[PDB]
Symmetry: D6
Subunit: 160 residues, 12 copies
């Protein structure tokens, strides 16, 4: 009847791990040498990439998995009331990274072209990103599992 | 007499894993720097590659292995009627990825040449893909095991 | 007196694995960026490489190891007459890959130079392959163990 | 009431490890070929990089994890008074690496541009670093866990 | 008094493994892109490298470790006179690879420069090899352990 | 009172391992393509690098760890007076590699610039090395642990 | 009253010469190395340039000046009825080159961009011409003087 | 008293010629390959150069010398009232080219940098012109002689 | 009635000169650096150009003008029967160069593409020539004047 | 006794002409493509060259020859008191260009290296000029003849 | 009867001039940048070109025309026996340059390929010359006129 | 008997002119882009070329022709004792340039290789000059005519 969510959290936990490590260092790994900017100006590349990518998706997520897994290893070793507390933390972190995500990345749709008007860059330049479609797809999966994990976590935290 | 399919599913499960990991990061790994486009136009490469490859085969498959393996880890931990349910999910996911596959990739035959008429690209350009033959071959194996796994799954789900 | 072949099959099984993984991703890994074609024509490289290498040796072999190892994991889990059946499959697969091998690759001697007259390629071009000698050597070892495994398998399948 | 800090130290220990290994060889790994200097002068690159990066962050930290983990493996095997000693060492090392860190790296804010006036380099050149923002972020996390680990360690060493 | 050689063989076995894997894919891994030939002639590189390196040292050795380790896994599983037989094979293989080694590689001293007069190569060209000194050093260690393993193996096979 | 050194040797043994593997293939791995020589002369690079680096630090050390770890696996399996013998070997090897180290590498301070007057190289050329500072630092740590391990080993070998 | 046209013909004759030789080998001289085509395909340049420029303006004109000046040197040396004949030829040649001009060059407005779909050229490529504006301007001057020379020539040939 | 201007016109006529031919094909001759634009975009060069240089100064001037010299060769051959007419034409042409000059070229001060936002050019690019100072100087001389020639021509045409 | 041909020969003589010198060093001058061959093979360019262009058109013609003008300067200075002799030579030379022309150059139509299978050139390569159309046009003019000069020369040599 | 200076002025006039035209377009002609600046920054070349060379020596001189030759063609045609006037102008122009010369060019010694800190140029860059010695030499000759021409002109203008 | 040779010498004198100046700076002018050597070795080009071309044909000839024309301007101005003297010099110079020619240039047939084994050049390299055929042709013409001029000069010097 | 030298001076005067202008701008014209230095160091080229070529031969000579021709135009216009004076100047200038020549250029033999150790240049570099042989040859001719002109000039100045 209740606490099926424990299962679903384990399922989605392992799921998220596998979604990352498989596509982890085989999608975004090449996202420094594949940022073709249409200029001879040295440095404009690194500037624009730092501009539109303060953090790469995979790092944010990996952190999110840690901060959301930390209450598990927290509640495991407590002694040799706390349940609901660790679970509430498990809500708010998740929600936080989702927020930060949408703020840094207007929506869940990578734009093929990105303009750029930083300093080394003389004027508005046109820099191209790698495989925006596919990254968008993986975003949709991980935000989806995020929303699920939230909703379950909220419901079973509402057990009264 | 029946439930030999449990064996065949384990066999083909491990099989599919081995078919991937062996040829996984040793076939498609070089499928970004081996997409020779016949133009000086910057960016046309990444655009055309994103066009004809929203997702690389191996990612789709890896997902398919997860969504089809999830009902196993689901049914394993249930308590400390559901059988047929997890099995039916195990059908529909498999079939789904096969459909998505054929839609994104007209048939199971990579074309050596691909034309391209996106934006950075001035007109219809001629971009060449890497090793289309061999990838086609591996597609045939994995779709084949897919069809098998379906057919078994349907039959033994038809046990009445 | 008999079924020493079980040992020899285990020995050669592990042997073949070790011959691969050692020289696996340390010989053929560089066999895309080391296919020097004497032309400016874009794409002629990928075309000619796909022409004379529909599959790289290591993939064929890896498959062969799987299809020949599958009857082992097959016979292991059967219940919780079949022996000779799994063994006969173990013959015919092995023989098949040897045939396919010799057909795709006229004999067991990589030619240093390969001509090529596909479409992007204007006329007969001269493309050079990497380390043909050494690959030939490893072919000789793996076909050799193949012939051995066949001969043993046939003899002990002839036990009557 | 007391020695909850043992937990928190294990938690943050494993935490720090995971923060590193995830972003370890996927952030700073490319920090040699992504140091774009605006000069033709050979060697000025390596000179300026050695100048402003005598050590890369990750090495310093990794050492810090070892010197701070060494008193654990020290106190574990002692026989087959020392507690407070190993703990005090565990304070002073941590504090030391924090100091060294702030000295080598004026504050916790990587500057996008760095000037350079070493020998091969004719005059003040303008060299650009990769992803200064993101590295700054990870610095903030690891110094943060550092300050926590200090404060706990000091308090529970003040148990009297 | 006798069969100390069993120890010494285990010691040197593990030794040889460690000498390889450490320097294995960190010395010879770059021995394709570091074969600087002083010509514009396409292909002359791959030709000359195949000429003076039919096999790279590490492959020969790895094989030698397998053929010399095979009699161990052979004698281990025999039943569920042979001792001296497996040991004699263990002699002759070792000696064989030492012979093949000295034949392919005149002595144990890599020459910095190598001339080359194959076909694509118009005339005698001057091709430079990478780090000949260091490879020579590792040759000396592995041939040394080889000679030791031989001598022990011969003596204790002479036990009468 | 005595044989605390057994602990300290285990501590520093594991320490040295961790100092290597962490910074092992993440510092010196790029020390072939980062040896910028100020000449068009082909080959002068490989010549000068072989000149001033007959061996890279990490190899020497790795060997030293093996030759110094070999008396441990030696004394472990002796039967199924020797103590002091294995320990004395454990002294002299350590001291040897320290000597060889200082001879090949005048002191423990990598020079940023290195001149070179070998054969392909027309005259005294100016070749630049990568990150000399940081490598110097790691040298200081490993020689330091070396001196410690010596001093302990000598003292407890002086137990009488 | 009449034969002012003799003057005007001398005036415009010398004029046309000066308009050419001044801008002759200082405008169109660089119209081979300034035909930037957006493709790597060898030869597509020369093909497209030959396509849209069977003849460069200046050659056509120079010929026109010769064929229109030939009746002058013709009528000069006749002996040591013909007047109207040489004059009529002087009309029809002029008119002819004007026609040929407008046919080869749709109007008197060089287009900045020119597409091209010849053979070496894979598909419709985008080739850019040099200084189309300025050449258009000089066309307007020379066609203008052409129309004048015609009109005068016709009128004074209509003297009856 | 009057018609000193005939002298001054001959003086300045020959002057202008000499100012051109000396600096003619030794200043602006290199003004196609010295228009460094900060972009990889093919064609943007020719576009921007055609934009800000519909005509190069020297052509405009050369024309002006012809149209202003034409009334001289006109008045010379008139027969074998007209004076003031040829002189008035000699005014209005001169004034015209001065006007056209100032319109095409905002003032007599070449700007070192010129932005550009034409079609091939993705956005506002920064293109650099060659030796803007020196060309400005020669403009000042030729406009100066122009103003003089005007003023004299007007005065002596005002002879009544 | 007769010897109008003297005029026509002077006319066409001066004509041919003017057709050359105008288009002389402004068409074929760039016919060495505009022979784009689709190969990296050094030297294949010069080989193929020497193959299909033993002589450039303009040289052949220039010679023809000299050998055909030599009988004029011959007959001019004879003293201080011969007429028909110098005229007959004037026929046969002209005819000769026309023959040689058609032999070296199959017809009067330059082919855009030329294949080439000389020695440095590995196989049949595809080399592109510059402006084949326009050169063909000038050939048609000069062969045309050649045929005229012949026909006149033959007729008036047939005066009897 | 007097007006030998007329001779000396003709002598030095023709002299100066010959000194220029010989070394004119054979020294400074290559002074745009031989201004090697040690930076990748586009445009910094043209900027720095315009900075330190507002005018090339030869232009200044050529002007000086014209303004100093203009009083000759002035005094020649005066009619069909003025002597001293044209001669005084002949002094002041000469002196003027000498002044302007020394101002633009600190002394008569071209510096091999020139630093530069204009806008595109990030900081003080090091740009190298071509053949500074030789240009200095020719400066010394032309300033020398200048001083002579002055001194004579002043003396014979002081005839009273 | 005699001294027709005066004519023939004038004819061939002017002839030789015209053969040169036409093909003079339009054949050998590009014979420095069209000497494609198949090596990366800097300098080997200039070395090999200096080796096989101590002097270019056209220089030798031009000298020969001067030394053979000098006795004409010699005999012209003698006063305001010598005839035969100037004529004999006119023989021996001509013959001399023919000898020097054949010595420097084995025969009158340029070889397409030339090997080269000078110092910078590591070993026998293969350098390709430009248009060897055509230069050979012009050699044949000029040596031919040389032999004629000799034979006439000898005969009419044999007038007795 | 005497003043044949007037002839010989005219002969050699015109000779020297022709030797220059023929080989003038067709030998040394390419002596800036053909100074191949074996270094990446920017600027070292221009430095070394300025070092070993403060002046190119042809300039020195051209000056020498002017200073030695100036006494001719001097003595021509003297009026509308001086003879020996102009002739003595004609000696000393000639001798001077010969001296300066031998000083700047150790002897009359251009060395193929030239070392260089100026400032930008890090150490002794190896720079290669173009066609040293041929330039040496022309030096021998012009110094030869120089010595002749001297000797004649001295003798006939010794007429008493």
């Amino acid at each position: 009847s209740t606490s099926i969510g424990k299962i679903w959290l384990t399922v989605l936990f392992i799921f998220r791990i596998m979604i990352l490590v498989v596509a982890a260092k085989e999608v975004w790994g090449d996202e420094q040498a594949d940022f073709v900017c249409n200029t001879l100006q040295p440095g404009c590349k690194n500037v624009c990439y730092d501009h539109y990518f303060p953090i790469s998706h995979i790092r944010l997520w990996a952190l999110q998995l840690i901060f959301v897994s930390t209450p598990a290893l927290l509640v495991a070793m407590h002694v040799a009331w706390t349940y609901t507390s660790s679970i509430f933390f498990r809500v708010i972190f998740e929600a936080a990274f989702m927020y930060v995500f949408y703020v840094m990345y207007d929506g869940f749709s990578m734009q093929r072209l990105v303009k750029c008007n930083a300093w080394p860059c003389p004027n508005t330049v046109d820099c191209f990103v790698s495989r925006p479609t596919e990254k968008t797809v993986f975003t949709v999966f991980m935000i989806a599992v995020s929303g699920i994990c939230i909703l379950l976590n909220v419901t079973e935290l509402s057990y009264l």
